[PDB]
mmCIF file of C-alpha atoms and ligand atoms in Angstrom:
data_model
loop_
_atom_site.group_PDB
_atom_site.id
_atom_site.type_symbol
_atom_site.label_atom_id
_atom_site.label_comp_id
_atom_site.label_asym_id
_atom_site.label_seq_id
_atom_site.Cartn_x
_atom_site.Cartn_y
_atom_site.Cartn_z
ATOM 1 C CA UNK A 1 -29.823 31.431 60.378
ATOM 2 C CA UNK A 2 -30.306 35.114 61.335
ATOM 3 C CA UNK A 3 -27.654 36.192 63.926
ATOM 4 C CA UNK A 4 -28.061 38.894 66.562
ATOM 5 C CA UNK A 5 -26.249 42.104 65.573
ATOM 6 C CA UNK A 6 -24.333 43.515 68.541
ATOM 7 C CA UNK A 7 -24.674 47.244 69.349
ATOM 8 C CA UNK A 8 -22.115 49.979 69.830
ATOM 9 C CA UNK A 9 -20.836 49.743 73.401
ATOM 10 C CA UNK A 10 -20.075 46.017 72.895
ATOM 11 C CA UNK A 11 -16.285 45.666 73.270
ATOM 12 C CA UNK A 12 -16.308 42.924 70.634
ATOM 13 C CA UNK A 13 -16.736 45.683 67.991
ATOM 14 C CA UNK A 14 -13.526 47.354 69.158
ATOM 15 C CA UNK A 15 -11.199 44.351 68.394
ATOM 16 C CA UNK A 16 -8.676 43.988 65.558
ATOM 17 C CA UNK A 17 -10.009 40.788 63.844
ATOM 18 C CA UNK A 18 -7.599 38.011 62.727
ATOM 19 C CA UNK A 19 -7.584 36.736 59.128
ATOM 20 C CA UNK A 20 -9.891 34.087 57.696
ATOM 21 C CA UNK A 21 -7.923 30.813 57.279
ATOM 22 C CA UNK A 22 -10.705 28.407 56.239
ATOM 23 C CA UNK A 23 -11.344 29.579 52.676
ATOM 24 C CA UNK A 24 -13.326 26.967 50.699
ATOM 25 C CA UNK A 25 -14.625 25.320 53.903
ATOM 26 C CA UNK A 26 -18.247 24.314 54.667
ATOM 27 C CA UNK A 27 -17.969 26.267 57.938
ATOM 28 C CA UNK A 28 -17.034 29.586 56.221
ATOM 29 C CA UNK A 29 -19.796 29.050 53.648
ATOM 30 C CA UNK A 30 -22.400 28.605 56.422
ATOM 31 C CA UNK A 31 -21.087 31.743 58.218
ATOM 32 C CA UNK A 32 -21.195 33.758 54.992
ATOM 33 C CA UNK A 33 -24.804 32.542 54.267
ATOM 34 C CA UNK A 34 -25.840 33.608 57.802
ATOM 35 C CA UNK A 35 -24.229 36.949 57.206
ATOM 36 C CA UNK A 36 -26.113 37.570 53.962
ATOM 37 C CA UNK A 37 -29.313 36.414 55.676
ATOM 38 C CA UNK A 38 -28.668 38.644 58.662
ATOM 39 C CA UNK A 39 -27.816 41.684 56.519
ATOM 40 C CA UNK A 40 -30.942 41.065 54.430
ATOM 41 C CA UNK A 41 -33.345 40.778 57.352
ATOM 42 C CA UNK A 42 -31.945 44.080 58.735
ATOM 43 C CA UNK A 43 -32.220 45.729 55.303
ATOM 44 C CA UNK A 44 -28.527 46.523 55.378
ATOM 45 C CA UNK A 45 -26.161 47.367 52.604
ATOM 46 C CA UNK A 46 -23.069 45.966 54.316
ATOM 47 C CA UNK A 47 -22.397 43.824 57.313
ATOM 48 C CA UNK A 48 -18.980 42.930 58.910
ATOM 49 C CA UNK A 49 -18.395 39.680 60.878
ATOM 50 C CA UNK A 50 -17.579 41.484 64.175
ATOM 51 C CA UNK A 51 -21.110 42.957 64.150
ATOM 52 C CA UNK A 52 -22.419 39.392 64.734
ATOM 53 C CA UNK A 53 -19.667 38.924 67.293
ATOM 54 C CA UNK A 54 -17.500 36.819 64.929
ATOM 55 C CA UNK A 55 -13.891 37.938 65.259
ATOM 56 C CA UNK A 56 -12.808 37.548 61.610
ATOM 57 C CA UNK A 57 -11.733 39.687 58.640
ATOM 58 C CA UNK A 58 -14.912 39.050 56.695
ATOM 59 C CA UNK A 59 -17.715 41.218 55.362
ATOM 60 C CA UNK A 60 -20.673 40.888 53.061
ATOM 61 C CA UNK A 61 -22.251 43.733 51.144
ATOM 62 C CA UNK A 62 -24.259 44.713 48.046
ATOM 63 C CA UNK A 63 -27.900 45.196 46.890
ATOM 64 C CA UNK A 64 -29.994 45.936 43.741
ATOM 65 C CA UNK A 65 -32.469 48.301 45.470
ATOM 66 C CA UNK A 68 -32.244 53.122 51.935
ATOM 67 C CA UNK A 69 -29.769 54.906 49.690
ATOM 68 C CA UNK A 70 -31.543 56.530 46.667
ATOM 69 C CA UNK A 71 -28.517 58.075 44.802
ATOM 70 C CA UNK A 72 -26.539 54.724 45.153
ATOM 71 C CA UNK A 73 -26.285 52.504 42.053
ATOM 72 C CA UNK A 74 -26.388 48.659 42.385
ATOM 73 C CA UNK A 75 -23.459 47.125 44.236
ATOM 74 C CA UNK A 76 -22.870 43.384 43.458
ATOM 75 C CA UNK A 77 -23.581 40.970 46.289
ATOM 76 C CA UNK A 78 -20.094 40.140 47.543
ATOM 77 C CA UNK A 79 -18.528 38.254 50.392
ATOM 78 C CA UNK A 80 -14.869 39.397 50.959
ATOM 79 C CA UNK A 81 -12.421 37.790 53.363
ATOM 80 C CA UNK A 82 -9.058 39.378 54.376
ATOM 81 C CA UNK A 83 -9.891 42.701 52.749
ATOM 82 C CA UNK A 84 -7.084 45.211 51.974
ATOM 83 C CA UNK A 85 -7.848 48.680 50.798
ATOM 84 C CA UNK A 86 -5.721 51.346 49.055
ATOM 85 C CA UNK A 87 -6.874 54.772 47.937
ATOM 86 C CA UNK A 88 -6.460 55.447 44.210
ATOM 87 C CA UNK A 89 -6.548 59.225 44.705
ATOM 88 C CA UNK A 90 -6.367 61.722 47.576
ATOM 89 C CA UNK A 91 -9.907 62.948 46.830
ATOM 90 C CA UNK A 92 -12.422 62.725 49.793
ATOM 91 C CA UNK A 93 -16.155 62.869 49.396
ATOM 92 C CA UNK A 94 -18.774 63.445 52.099
ATOM 93 C CA UNK A 95 -21.827 61.234 52.375
ATOM 94 C CA UNK A 96 -24.527 59.860 54.706
ATOM 95 C CA UNK A 97 -23.775 56.665 56.712
ATOM 96 C CA UNK A 98 -25.729 54.672 59.306
ATOM 97 C CA UNK A 99 -24.690 51.343 60.920
ATOM 98 C CA UNK A 100 -26.839 48.434 62.070
ATOM 99 C CA UNK A 101 -24.840 48.390 65.349
ATOM 100 C CA UNK A 102 -25.969 52.104 65.876
ATOM 101 C CA UNK A 103 -29.743 51.869 65.101
ATOM 102 C CA UNK A 104 -31.748 55.077 64.549
ATOM 103 C CA UNK A 105 -28.780 57.396 63.773
ATOM 104 C CA UNK A 106 -26.796 58.692 60.826
ATOM 105 C CA UNK A 107 -24.000 61.244 60.077
ATOM 106 C CA UNK A 108 -22.088 62.715 57.159
ATOM 107 C CA UNK A 109 -18.662 61.016 56.917
ATOM 108 C CA UNK A 110 -15.771 61.776 54.613
ATOM 109 C CA UNK A 111 -14.372 58.777 52.691
ATOM 110 C CA UNK A 112 -11.971 58.314 49.757
ATOM 111 C CA UNK A 113 -14.001 58.631 46.599
ATOM 112 C CA UNK A 114 -11.763 56.067 44.698
ATOM 113 C CA UNK A 115 -10.214 52.846 46.086
ATOM 114 C CA UNK A 116 -8.927 49.470 45.123
ATOM 115 C CA UNK A 117 -9.855 46.601 47.330
ATOM 116 C CA UNK A 118 -8.392 43.044 47.317
ATOM 117 C CA UNK A 119 -9.040 39.822 49.246
ATOM 118 C CA UNK A 120 -10.692 36.432 48.677
ATOM 119 C CA UNK A 121 -14.190 35.142 47.950
ATOM 120 C CA UNK A 122 -15.344 32.413 50.411
ATOM 121 C CA UNK A 123 -14.397 29.725 47.860
ATOM 122 C CA UNK A 124 -10.775 30.999 48.033
ATOM 123 C CA UNK A 125 -10.566 32.665 44.614
ATOM 124 C CA UNK A 126 -8.995 36.198 44.672
ATOM 125 C CA UNK A 127 -11.200 39.347 44.401
ATOM 126 C CA UNK A 128 -9.698 42.674 43.343
ATOM 127 C CA UNK A 129 -11.693 45.631 42.246
ATOM 128 C CA UNK A 130 -11.408 49.363 41.770
ATOM 129 C CA UNK A 131 -14.494 50.988 43.356
ATOM 130 C CA UNK A 132 -15.805 54.542 43.654
ATOM 131 C CA UNK A 133 -18.587 56.548 45.311
ATOM 132 C CA UNK A 134 -21.048 54.574 47.431
ATOM 133 C CA UNK A 135 -19.528 51.182 46.491
ATOM 134 C CA UNK A 136 -16.162 52.437 47.799
ATOM 135 C CA UNK A 137 -17.741 53.974 50.902
ATOM 136 C CA UNK A 138 -19.502 50.788 51.869
ATOM 137 C CA UNK A 139 -16.291 48.759 51.680
ATOM 138 C CA UNK A 140 -14.301 51.373 53.682
ATOM 139 C CA UNK A 141 -17.023 51.456 56.384
ATOM 140 C CA UNK A 142 -17.111 47.655 56.685
ATOM 141 C CA UNK A 143 -13.306 47.488 56.669
ATOM 142 C CA UNK A 144 -13.271 49.896 59.710
ATOM 143 C CA UNK A 145 -15.277 47.293 61.675
ATOM 144 C CA UNK A 146 -12.386 44.770 61.142
ATOM 145 C CA UNK A 147 -9.971 47.156 62.878
ATOM 146 C CA UNK A 148 -12.344 48.022 65.766
ATOM 147 C CA UNK A 149 -13.593 51.397 64.347
ATOM 148 C CA UNK A 150 -17.129 52.795 63.965
ATOM 149 C CA UNK A 151 -18.265 55.888 62.011
ATOM 150 C CA UNK A 152 -18.695 58.332 64.929
ATOM 151 C CA UNK A 153 -14.887 58.598 65.403
ATOM 152 C CA UNK A 154 -14.818 59.757 61.771
ATOM 153 C CA UNK A 155 -17.469 62.560 61.906
ATOM 154 C CA UNK A 156 -15.974 66.067 61.283
ATOM 155 C CA UNK A 157 -19.239 68.036 61.228
ATOM 156 C CA UNK A 158 -21.298 67.141 64.339
ATOM 157 C CA UNK A 159 -24.257 69.191 63.023
ATOM 158 C CA UNK A 160 -24.928 66.282 60.628
ATOM 159 C CA UNK A 161 -25.072 63.578 63.374
ATOM 160 C CA UNK A 162 -28.625 62.779 64.583
ATOM 161 C CA UNK A 163 -31.625 60.511 64.443
ATOM 162 C CA UNK A 164 -32.710 59.486 60.956
ATOM 163 C CA UNK A 165 -36.370 60.577 61.493
ATOM 164 C CA UNK A 166 -35.311 64.065 62.675
ATOM 165 C CA UNK A 167 -32.312 65.199 60.515
ATOM 166 C CA UNK A 168 -32.900 67.910 57.839
ATOM 167 C CA UNK A 169 -29.218 68.505 56.988
ATOM 168 C CA UNK A 170 -28.950 69.070 53.258
ATOM 169 C CA UNK A 171 -25.676 67.494 52.097
ATOM 170 C CA UNK B 1 -47.314 70.810 81.308
ATOM 171 C CA UNK B 2 -44.822 68.182 80.045
ATOM 172 C CA UNK B 3 -43.125 69.387 76.792
ATOM 173 C CA UNK B 4 -41.778 67.179 74.013
ATOM 174 C CA UNK B 5 -37.973 66.918 74.147
ATOM 175 C CA UNK B 6 -36.493 67.290 70.662
ATOM 176 C CA UNK B 7 -33.851 64.769 69.505
ATOM 177 C CA UNK B 8 -30.371 65.205 68.105
ATOM 178 C CA UNK B 9 -30.708 65.936 64.391
ATOM 179 C CA UNK B 10 -33.192 68.757 65.158
ATOM 180 C CA UNK B 11 -31.517 71.977 63.953
ATOM 181 C CA UNK B 12 -33.128 73.861 66.837
ATOM 182 C CA UNK B 13 -30.510 72.252 69.146
ATOM 183 C CA UNK B 14 -27.699 73.742 67.064
ATOM 184 C CA UNK B 15 -28.692 77.446 67.624
ATOM 185 C CA UNK B 16 -26.959 80.043 69.813
ATOM 186 C CA UNK B 17 -29.864 81.018 72.172
ATOM 187 C CA UNK B 18 -30.547 84.702 73.026
ATOM 188 C CA UNK B 19 -30.726 85.891 76.650
ATOM 189 C CA UNK B 20 -33.778 85.726 78.898
ATOM 190 C CA UNK B 21 -35.265 89.253 79.241
ATOM 191 C CA UNK B 22 -38.468 88.516 81.192
ATOM 192 C CA UNK B 23 -37.031 87.764 84.633
ATOM 193 C CA UNK B 24 -39.749 87.907 87.326
ATOM 194 C CA UNK B 25 -42.533 87.411 84.743
ATOM 195 C CA UNK B 26 -45.481 84.967 84.978
ATOM 196 C CA UNK B 27 -44.518 83.666 81.518
ATOM 197 C CA UNK B 28 -40.927 82.723 82.547
ATOM 198 C CA UNK B 29 -42.249 81.115 85.742
ATOM 199 C CA UNK B 30 -44.664 78.925 83.731
ATOM 200 C CA UNK B 31 -41.839 77.959 81.306
ATOM 201 C CA UNK B 32 -39.513 77.109 84.194
ATOM 202 C CA UNK B 33 -42.275 74.981 85.888
ATOM 203 C CA UNK B 34 -42.800 73.094 82.590
ATOM 204 C CA UNK B 35 -39.090 72.547 82.378
ATOM 205 C CA UNK B 36 -38.845 71.065 85.870
ATOM 206 C CA UNK B 37 -41.909 68.933 85.109
ATOM 207 C CA UNK B 38 -40.457 67.804 81.805
ATOM 208 C CA UNK B 39 -37.037 67.007 83.297
ATOM 209 C CA UNK B 40 -38.736 65.093 86.120
ATOM 210 C CA UNK B 41 -40.949 62.955 83.901
ATOM 211 C CA UNK B 42 -37.848 62.017 81.833
ATOM 212 C CA UNK B 43 -35.859 61.268 85.004
ATOM 213 C CA UNK B 44 -33.241 63.788 83.969
ATOM 214 C CA UNK B 45 -30.632 65.556 85.986
ATOM 215 C CA UNK B 46 -30.496 68.651 83.783
ATOM 216 C CA UNK B 47 -32.567 70.059 80.999
ATOM 217 C CA UNK B 48 -31.820 73.139 78.769
ATOM 218 C CA UNK B 49 -34.593 75.241 77.134
ATOM 219 C CA UNK B 50 -33.466 74.457 73.541
ATOM 220 C CA UNK B 51 -34.175 70.757 74.211
ATOM 221 C CA UNK B 52 -37.901 71.679 74.393
ATOM 222 C CA UNK B 53 -37.394 73.858 71.338
ATOM 223 C CA UNK B 54 -37.371 77.113 73.369
ATOM 224 C CA UNK B 55 -34.596 79.346 72.068
ATOM 225 C CA UNK B 56 -33.471 80.895 75.381
ATOM 226 C CA UNK B 57 -30.466 80.898 77.730
ATOM 227 C CA UNK B 58 -32.241 78.934 80.429
ATOM 228 C CA UNK B 59 -31.689 75.583 82.104
ATOM 229 C CA UNK B 60 -33.014 73.665 85.057
ATOM 230 C CA UNK B 61 -31.117 70.988 86.925
ATOM 231 C CA UNK B 62 -30.683 69.182 90.262
ATOM 232 C CA UNK B 63 -31.987 66.102 92.171
ATOM 233 C CA UNK B 64 -31.781 64.371 95.607
ATOM 234 C CA UNK B 65 -31.610 60.796 94.228
ATOM 235 C CA UNK B 68 -29.106 57.408 87.348
ATOM 236 C CA UNK B 69 -25.802 58.658 88.714
ATOM 237 C CA UNK B 70 -24.738 56.661 91.845
ATOM 238 C CA UNK B 71 -21.419 58.448 92.745
ATOM 239 C CA UNK B 72 -23.142 61.932 92.355
ATOM 240 C CA UNK B 73 -24.073 63.797 95.558
ATOM 241 C CA UNK B 74 -27.316 65.886 95.735
ATOM 242 C CA UNK B 75 -27.408 68.909 93.452
ATOM 243 C CA UNK B 76 -29.932 71.634 94.525
ATOM 244 C CA UNK B 77 -32.931 72.100 92.258
ATOM 245 C CA UNK B 78 -32.013 75.243 90.335
ATOM 246 C CA UNK B 79 -33.360 77.244 87.452
ATOM 247 C CA UNK B 80 -30.594 79.474 85.907
ATOM 248 C CA UNK B 81 -31.134 82.083 83.213
ATOM 249 C CA UNK B 82 -28.272 83.763 81.253
ATOM 250 C CA UNK B 83 -25.655 81.378 82.608
ATOM 251 C CA UNK B 84 -21.928 82.298 82.390
ATOM 252 C CA UNK B 85 -19.261 79.829 83.275
ATOM 253 C CA UNK B 86 -15.549 80.228 84.130
ATOM 254 C CA UNK B 87 -13.139 77.462 85.057
ATOM 255 C CA UNK B 88 -11.496 77.866 88.471
ATOM 256 C CA UNK B 89 -8.605 75.559 87.550
ATOM 257 C CA UNK B 90 -7.162 73.916 84.431
ATOM 258 C CA UNK B 91 -7.907 70.440 85.830
ATOM 259 C CA UNK B 92 -10.139 68.170 83.589
ATOM 260 C CA UNK B 93 -11.945 65.119 84.828
ATOM 261 C CA UNK B 94 -13.527 62.337 82.765
ATOM 262 C CA UNK B 95 -17.027 61.107 83.486
ATOM 263 C CA UNK B 96 -20.141 59.428 82.039
ATOM 264 C CA UNK B 97 -22.788 61.628 80.322
ATOM 265 C CA UNK B 98 -26.062 60.877 78.523
ATOM 266 C CA UNK B 99 -28.571 63.433 77.133
ATOM 267 C CA UNK B 100 -32.353 63.229 76.886
ATOM 268 C CA UNK B 101 -32.077 64.467 73.260
ATOM 269 C CA UNK B 102 -29.808 61.353 72.560
ATOM 270 C CA UNK B 103 -31.853 58.532 74.220
ATOM 271 C CA UNK B 104 -30.213 55.132 74.828
ATOM 272 C CA UNK B 105 -26.554 56.292 74.595
ATOM 273 C CA UNK B 106 -23.744 57.514 76.812
ATOM 274 C CA UNK B 107 -19.996 58.398 76.566
ATOM 275 C CA UNK B 108 -17.091 59.455 78.751
ATOM 276 C CA UNK B 109 -16.559 63.233 78.391
ATOM 277 C CA UNK B 110 -13.843 65.416 79.842
ATOM 278 C CA UNK B 111 -15.063 68.510 81.737
ATOM 279 C CA UNK B 112 -13.453 71.078 84.060
ATOM 280 C CA UNK B 113 -13.553 69.643 87.542
ATOM 281 C CA UNK B 114 -13.973 73.162 89.167
ATOM 282 C CA UNK B 115 -16.066 76.097 87.861
ATOM 283 C CA UNK B 116 -17.874 79.199 88.904
ATOM 284 C CA UNK B 117 -21.212 79.829 87.346
ATOM 285 C CA UNK B 118 -23.295 83.060 87.453
ATOM 286 C CA UNK B 119 -26.702 84.153 86.141
ATOM 287 C CA UNK B 120 -30.201 84.838 87.494
ATOM 288 C CA UNK B 121 -32.963 82.842 89.173
ATOM 289 C CA UNK B 122 -36.368 83.177 87.406
ATOM 290 C CA UNK B 123 -37.433 85.803 89.975
ATOM 291 C CA UNK B 124 -34.488 87.978 88.803
ATOM 292 C CA UNK B 125 -32.227 87.608 91.846
ATOM 293 C CA UNK B 126 -28.536 86.838 90.987
ATOM 294 C CA UNK B 127 -27.117 83.276 91.378
ATOM 295 C CA UNK B 128 -23.368 82.706 91.637
ATOM 296 C CA UNK B 129 -21.798 79.526 92.799
ATOM 297 C CA UNK B 130 -18.515 77.667 92.732
ATOM 298 C CA UNK B 131 -19.239 74.041 91.725
ATOM 299 C CA UNK B 132 -17.142 70.900 91.308
ATOM 300 C CA UNK B 133 -17.411 67.292 90.115
ATOM 301 C CA UNK B 134 -20.833 66.178 88.890
ATOM 302 C CA UNK B 135 -22.534 69.475 89.858
ATOM 303 C CA UNK B 136 -20.009 71.313 87.654
ATOM 304 C CA UNK B 137 -20.346 68.770 84.842
ATOM 305 C CA UNK B 138 -24.099 69.061 84.715
ATOM 306 C CA UNK B 139 -23.961 72.848 84.393
ATOM 307 C CA UNK B 140 -21.243 72.706 81.675
ATOM 308 C CA UNK B 141 -23.279 70.125 79.697
ATOM 309 C CA UNK B 142 -26.469 72.205 79.895
ATOM 310 C CA UNK B 143 -24.546 75.379 79.039
ATOM 311 C CA UNK B 144 -23.293 73.647 75.802
ATOM 312 C CA UNK B 145 -26.941 73.282 74.697
ATOM 313 C CA UNK B 146 -27.295 77.137 74.845
ATOM 314 C CA UNK B 147 -24.469 77.502 72.311
ATOM 315 C CA UNK B 148 -25.727 74.730 69.976
ATOM 316 C CA UNK B 149 -23.340 71.953 71.221
ATOM 317 C CA UNK B 150 -24.029 68.336 72.247
ATOM 318 C CA UNK B 151 -21.684 65.878 74.016
ATOM 319 C CA UNK B 152 -20.624 63.765 71.002
ATOM 320 C CA UNK B 153 -18.464 66.633 69.620
ATOM 321 C CA UNK B 154 -16.639 66.468 72.965
ATOM 322 C CA UNK B 155 -15.836 62.695 73.111
ATOM 323 C CA UNK B 156 -12.047 61.962 72.929
ATOM 324 C CA UNK B 157 -12.204 58.196 73.505
ATOM 325 C CA UNK B 158 -14.769 56.664 71.097
ATOM 326 C CA UNK B 159 -14.400 53.253 72.808
ATOM 327 C CA UNK B 160 -16.553 54.680 75.632
ATOM 328 C CA UNK B 161 -19.461 55.781 73.350
ATOM 329 C CA UNK B 162 -22.308 53.220 73.116
ATOM 330 C CA UNK B 163 -25.729 52.117 74.233
ATOM 331 C CA UNK B 164 -26.326 52.259 77.976
ATOM 332 C CA UNK B 165 -27.546 48.606 78.181
ATOM 333 C CA UNK B 166 -24.430 47.310 76.364
ATOM 334 C CA UNK B 167 -21.389 49.347 77.604
ATOM 335 C CA UNK B 168 -18.888 47.640 79.989
ATOM 336 C CA UNK B 169 -16.219 50.380 79.874
ATOM 337 C CA UNK B 170 -14.744 50.730 83.339
ATOM 338 C CA UNK B 171 -13.978 54.427 83.886
HETATM 339 C C1 LIG C 1 -32.046 49.716 58.205
HETATM 340 C C2 LIG C 1 -31.050 50.076 57.104
HETATM 341 O O1 LIG C 1 -29.904 50.565 57.815
HETATM 342 C C3 LIG C 1 -28.606 50.841 57.230
HETATM 343 O O2 LIG C 1 -28.269 50.139 56.263
HETATM 344 C C4 LIG C 1 -27.733 51.950 57.789
HETATM 345 N N1 LIG C 1 -26.461 52.022 57.046
HETATM 346 C C5 LIG C 1 -25.530 51.033 57.044
HETATM 347 O O3 LIG C 1 -25.632 50.045 57.774
HETATM 348 C C6 LIG C 1 -24.265 51.137 56.205
HETATM 349 C C7 LIG C 1 -23.332 50.064 56.161
HETATM 350 S S1 LIG C 1 -22.018 50.549 55.155
HETATM 351 C C8 LIG C 1 -22.649 52.136 54.865
HETATM 352 C C9 LIG C 1 -22.017 53.166 53.976
HETATM 353 C C10 LIG C 1 -23.880 52.299 55.449
HETATM 354 C C1 LIG C 2 -33.222 58.757 81.675
HETATM 355 C C2 LIG C 2 -32.135 59.491 82.459
HETATM 356 O O1 LIG C 2 -31.288 60.048 81.445
HETATM 357 C C3 LIG C 2 -30.226 61.011 81.671
HETATM 358 O O2 LIG C 2 -30.386 61.806 82.611
HETATM 359 C C4 LIG C 2 -28.990 61.009 80.790
HETATM 360 N N1 LIG C 2 -28.071 62.087 81.200
HETATM 361 C C5 LIG C 2 -28.367 63.410 81.106
HETATM 362 O O3 LIG C 2 -29.392 63.806 80.547
HETATM 363 C C6 LIG C 2 -27.404 64.476 81.605
HETATM 364 C C7 LIG C 2 -27.757 65.853 81.562
HETATM 365 S S1 LIG C 2 -26.420 66.760 82.164
HETATM 366 C C8 LIG C 2 -25.410 65.373 82.396
HETATM 367 C C9 LIG C 2 -24.027 65.400 82.978
HETATM 368 C C10 LIG C 2 -26.079 64.211 82.101
HETATM 369 NA NA1 LIG C 3 -9.606 48.820 69.603
HETATM 370 NA NA1 LIG C 4 -24.503 76.013 65.535
#
């Protein structure tokens, strides 16, 4: 089932979500399937559970094919994500958010991370990630601690409506 | 004539506008009349010339009657505005912007200012202003130096879509 995505301004996006504790359950599997369905209908590249007003440490992300420079990111559902930078190096790049429709900004992120957590069937996931793959997971992780991209913008010249911006990163 | 209001992302909002040098002219008077007409159709409380893609130090503002707590602000067209705080005191309050439709945030502004400049007929204007009157003029003045309200937000919990926010200032 497609779920409504809540918009910035909704206090439910500002919460610190608790951990997932029903790994392997039918209920988590249904939630995850809704999330992938919801992300897909919205043409997203990542979606975090608080964006459908579900207070849990859970995100889905990935796509084959709008982010032209971005290589494929495997379709992944990750519960209880933890992230650690693997270098100090920051890289700037474009982000939008389905809870902030119409807009985008340049945001600095760590270029190189490791992330760890669990797949919905309860098996561990741990991966080193870089570039857009890494950015997507850091952006979704922010949602789980009640953070959205605008509080991360450094250059406000790059923040604007997607159909109007001509900032050349 | 109603002019298109350009949206955030348009580089023309990021310019430092030059001064008005045609005080008393038919051309300025027509521009000002368009501005008041444009602001009115959009139900604004202030509009700055760069928001209609006119690179000039010029703003219109004021209204009898959406900002419930706000008393009447006289209808005013101000060219070559200069602003000086009359106290260090900051006050938080809600702002939106016609170049950023759908959104609003809490923004700190000086509670008490003086502003000076010229009416379109070339006579001097100078006024002490406080509260919402003061805020409106500071917000429009920012447009003349290529600044929009998001680069002034301190509390990102208060930034969101007008139909969704339940932040209680
Ligand atoms: C209609 C398509 O909109 C979008 O996908 C806008 N961008 C995102 O939602 C996004 C999530 S993580 C990240 C790095 C970007
Ligand atoms: C549709 C009505 O929208 C608005 O008026 C949104 N707020 C403004 O544009 C504004 C200009 S100065 C200031 C303090 C607020
Ligand atoms: Na919070
Ligand atoms: Na600028």
